[PDB]
Amino acid sequence: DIDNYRVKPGKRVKLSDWATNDDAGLSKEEGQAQTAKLAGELAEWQERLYAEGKQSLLLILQARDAAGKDGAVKKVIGAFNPAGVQITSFKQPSAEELSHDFLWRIHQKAPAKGYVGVFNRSQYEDVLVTRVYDMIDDKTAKRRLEHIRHFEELLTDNATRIVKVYLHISPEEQKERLQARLDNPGKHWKFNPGDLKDRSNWDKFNDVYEDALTTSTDDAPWYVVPADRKWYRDLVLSHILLGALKDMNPQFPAIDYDPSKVVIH
Amino acid sequence: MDIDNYRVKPGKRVKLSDWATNDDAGLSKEEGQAQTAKLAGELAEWQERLYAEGKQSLLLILQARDAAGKDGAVKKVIGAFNPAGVQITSFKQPSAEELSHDFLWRIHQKAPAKGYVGVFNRSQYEDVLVTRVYDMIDDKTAKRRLEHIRHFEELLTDNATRIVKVYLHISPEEQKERLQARLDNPGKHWKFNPGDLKDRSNWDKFNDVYEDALTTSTDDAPWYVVPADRKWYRDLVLSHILLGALKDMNPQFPAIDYDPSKVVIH
Numbered sequence: 001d002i003d004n005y006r007v008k009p010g011k012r013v014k015l016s017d018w019a020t021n022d023d024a025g026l027s028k029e030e031g032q033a034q035t036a037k038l039a040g041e042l043a044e045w046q047e048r049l050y051a052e053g054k055q056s057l058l059l060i061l062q063a064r065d066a067a068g069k070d071g072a073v074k075k076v077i078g079a080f081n082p083a084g085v086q087i088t089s090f091k092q093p094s095a096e097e098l099s100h101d102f103l104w105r106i107h108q109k110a111p112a113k114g115y116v117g118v119f120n121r122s123q124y125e126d127v128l129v130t131r132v133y134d135m136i137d138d139k140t141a142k143r144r145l146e147h148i149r150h151f152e153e154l155l156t157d158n159a160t161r162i163v164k165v166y167l168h169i170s171p172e173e174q175k176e177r178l179q180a181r182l183d184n185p186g187k188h189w190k191f192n193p194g195d196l197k198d199r200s201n202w203d204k205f206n207d208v209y210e211d212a213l214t215t216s217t218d219d220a221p222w223y224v225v226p227a228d229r230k231w232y233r234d235l236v237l238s239h240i241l242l243g244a245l246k247d248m249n250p251q252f253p254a255i256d257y258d259p260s261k262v263v264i265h
Numbered sequence: 266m267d268i269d270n271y272r273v274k275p276g277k278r279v280k281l282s283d284w285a286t287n288d289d290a291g292l293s294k295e296e297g298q299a300q301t302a303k304l305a306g307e308l309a310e311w312q313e314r315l316y317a318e319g320k321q322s323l324l325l326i327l328q329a330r331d332a333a334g335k336d337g338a339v340k341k342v343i344g345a346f347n348p349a350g351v352q353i354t355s356f357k358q359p360s361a362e363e364l365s366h367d368f369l370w371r372i373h374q375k376a377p378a379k380g381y382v383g384v385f386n387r388s389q390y391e392d393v394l395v396t397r398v399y400d401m402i403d404d405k406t407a408k409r410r411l412e413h414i415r416h417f418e419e420l421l422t423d424n425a426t427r428i429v430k431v432y433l434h435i436s437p438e439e440q441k442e443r444l445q446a447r448l449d450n451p452g453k454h455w456k457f458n459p460g461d462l463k464d465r466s467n468w469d470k471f472n473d474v475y476e477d478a479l480t481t482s483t484d485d486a487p488w489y490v491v492p493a494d495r496k497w498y499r500d501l502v503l504s505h506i507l508l509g510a511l512k513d514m515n516p517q518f519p520a521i522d523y524d525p526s527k528v529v530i531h
C-alpha cells in the first residue's frame with residue numbers, strides 16, 4: 001500500500017504515474033488521528049535508534065517550491081526528539097562549496113550513529129536546477145548520478161538507512177500556494193518573482209526529476225508522495241519513516257548494573 | 266511568581282534558595298498547558314519574523330542538573346518554533362580535539378547565525394561547573410573562565426545575538442522521583458548511570474558553583490531561575506521568557522523589491 005509510492009529499481013518512471021492528491025479513502029480527521037498515533041511510535045523507535053548508537057536514518061526531501069518540504073519537517077520530523085535529529089537545509093552553494101566537488105558539502109552533513117539526519121534539498125539539486133538552466137549537460141549529469149549512487153551505497157554500508165522522498169504536487173496546487181504568499185503580507189518575504197521562471201520550465205523539471213528517481217534501489221529507495229493534501233503528505237511520510245525504523249529494529253543496549261539493586265539517596 | 270521575579274538581577278551574590286522549585290502561579294496544570302499552547306503560536310510568528318528579517322539571533326542556554334527538564338523543555342517549547350530556524354547543540358564531554366583548544370573554541374563554533382534561534386543544551390558553563398566540583402580546575406581558574414564567558418557573551422550581544430540563560434530549578438526530592446522512574450521503566454535504563462549519583466551526593470557543591478555561574482547575569486545577558494518541579498510550569502515560564510525576548514527584539518518583515526499586486530503568476 002505505502003509500497004505503491006516506492007519507485008521500483010531498474011525501471012524509469014513518469015511523475016504522472018502517480019496522482020498528486022491521494023487520500024487513501026481516509027477523511028482528513030482520520031488521517032490526522034493516524035498521524036498523531038504514528039508520532040508516538042516514531043518517538044519510541046527514534047529513542048531506540050539513539051540509545052543503540054549503531055545505526056542512523058537519512059531522510060532526503062527533494063521537491064519544488066511550495067511542495068511542502070518545510071511543513072513535512074515541522075509536522076513529521078517534529079515527532080522525533082530534536083536532540084536526536086540533525087536537519088540541514090541546502091541552499092545555493094557558497095564560493096567555498098563551489099571550489100569543492102559537489103558532494104563535499106553534502107557528505108559533511110551525513111548523520112552520526114544514533115541520529116536521524118534530514119536533508120531539506122540535497123545532492124540531487126546538483127542534477128536538477130543545474131540541468132534545467134544548462135549549467136551542466138547530460139554527460140555530466142550521468143556522472144553525477146553515478147557519484148550520488150556511490151555515495152548512497154557508502155552510507156548504506158555504514159548502516160545509514162537512506163529514504164528519499166519526492167513531494168508530488170500539481171502545478172495548480174503550486175500556483176494556489178504561491179498566490180497565497182503574495183496575498184499574505186506576512187509571506188511576501190518568502191516569494192521571489194524571479195523564481196517564476198521555474199514554472200515556465202515545469203516540464204523540464206519533470207524530466208530531470210524523473211532522471212533523479214533512477215537512483216531508487218532496494219537499499220536506497222525513492223518514494224513519490226502525493227502532497228497536494230498536506231495532511232496526507234504527513235501521514236504517508238510518517239509511515240515511510242516508521243517502516244524504516246521498524247525494519248532497522250534498533251535495540252536498547254545491555255546495561256552494566258542491576259536496576260533493582262540501585263539505591264537513590 | 267511574575268516572570269521578572271525569576272530573573273537573576275545583576276550583582277555579585279546569588280542564592281538559589283531565594284526561589285521555590287515548585288511555583289504554579291496559582292494555575293492548574295490544565296490552565297497552564299492551555300496558556301502554553303496559546304503562546305506557542307506567538308512564538309512561531311515571532312520566530313518567522315526573526316528569520317525573515319535576518320538581522321538578529323536568539324541564543325537560549327539551558328543549564329541544569331540531571332532530570333531537571335532540559336530535554337523536555339527543548340521538546341515542548343523549542344518545538345513551537347519552525348525547526349528550519351532552530352539550531353540545537355547538546356554539549357557533551359569534550360573530545361580530545363576540543364580539549365586541545367581553549368574552552369570556548371567548541372562553544373563559539375555553535376553560536377547562531379543571523380535569523381536563527383540557537384539552543385545550547387548545556388553550554389560554556391559546564392567548564393565552570395562539573396570541572397570545579399571534581400577538582401579539575403581550582404577557584405582562581407574558575408573566576409578567570411567566568412570573566413572569559415562574560416566577554417564572550419558581550420561579543421555575541423554586540424552582534425545582535427540576544428542571550429537568555431535558563432537554570433531549571435528542581436528540588437532533590439523531585440530529582441529522586443524522576444531518577445527512580447528511569448530505573449522503574451525498562452525503556453529508560455539506558456539513560457540512568459549509577460555512577461552519576463555521585464553528583465547528587467555533591468548537590469550542595471553544585472549549588473555553590475551554579476550560584477557563581479549565575480553572577481554572569483546582566484541586563485543584556487540575563488539568567489532566569491525557572492521553578493521546574495512541575496514540568497508544565499517550566500514550559501509555561503520558558504515560553505514567556507522567550508516570547509518577551511522576541512517581542513523586545515521586535516524583528517520586522519523586510520522591505521521587498523517588487524509590488525505583490527502586480528505579480529501575475531502563470
Ligand SMILES: Nc1ncnc2c1ncn2[C@@H]1O[C@H](COP(=O)(O)OP(=O)(O)OP(=O)(O)O)[C@@H](O)[C@H]1O
Binds near residue numbers: 063064065067093122
Ligand atoms: N547544488 C545547488 N545548485 C544550485 N542551486 C541550489 C543547490 N542547492 C540548493 N540550491 C537552491 O538554493 C535555493 C534555496 O532557496 P530558499 O532557501 O529561498 O528556498 P526555496 O527557494 O523555497 O527552495 P525550493 O525551491 O526548493 O522550495 C533553492 O532555489 C535551491 O534550488
Ligand SMILES: Nc1ncnc2c1ncn2[C@@H]1O[C@H](COP(=O)(O)OP(=O)(O)OP(=O)(O)O)[C@@H](O)[C@H]1O
Binds near residue numbers: 357359391392
Ligand atoms: N566542558 C565539559 N567538561 C566536562 N564535562 C562536560 C562538559 N560539557 C558537558 N559535559 C558533560 O557531558 C555529559 C553529557 O552526558 P549525557 O548526554 O549523558 O547527558 P546527562 O548525563 O543527562 O547530562 P545532565 O547531567 O546535564 O542532565 C554531562 O554529564 C555533562 O556534564
Ligand SMILES: Nc1ncnc2c1ncn2[C@@H]1O[C@H](COP(=O)(O)OP(=O)(O)OP(=O)(O)O)[C@@H](O)[C@H]1O
Binds near residue numbers: 050084329337456
Ligand atoms: N529520545 C532521545 N533522542 C535523542 N537523544 C536523547 C533522547 N533522550 C535523551 N537523549 C540524550 O541523552 C542524554 C540523557 O538524556 P536526559 O533525559 O538526561 O536529557 P537531558 O537533555 O540531560 O535533560 P534533563 O535536564 O532532563 O537531564 C542527553 O544527552 C539527551 O540529549
Ligand SMILES: Nc1ncnc2c1ncn2[C@@H]1O[C@H](COP(=O)(O)OP(=O)(O)OP(=O)(O)O)[C@@H](O)[C@H]1O
Binds near residue numbers: 063064067069348
Ligand atoms: N519560519 C521559518 N523559520 C526559518 N526558516 C524558514 C521559515 N520559513 C521558511 N524558512 C526557510 O525559508 C525558505 C523558503 O521557505 P519555503 O516556505 O519555500 O520552505 P521550503 O523548505 O522551501 O519548503 P517548500 O517545499 O514548501 O517550498 C526555505 O529555505 C525555508 O527553510
Ligand SMILES: [Cl-]
Binds near residue numbers: 413
Ligand atoms: Cl581561562
Ligand SMILES: [Mg+2]
Binds near residue numbers: 065066067
Ligand atoms: Mg520553498
Ligand SMILES: [Mg+2]
Binds near residue numbers: 065192195
Ligand atoms: Mg525560491
Ligand SMILES: [Mg+2]
Binds near residue numbers: 330331332333
Ligand atoms: Mg540529563
Ligand SMILES: [Mg+2]
Binds near residue numbers: 461
Ligand atoms: Mg549523566
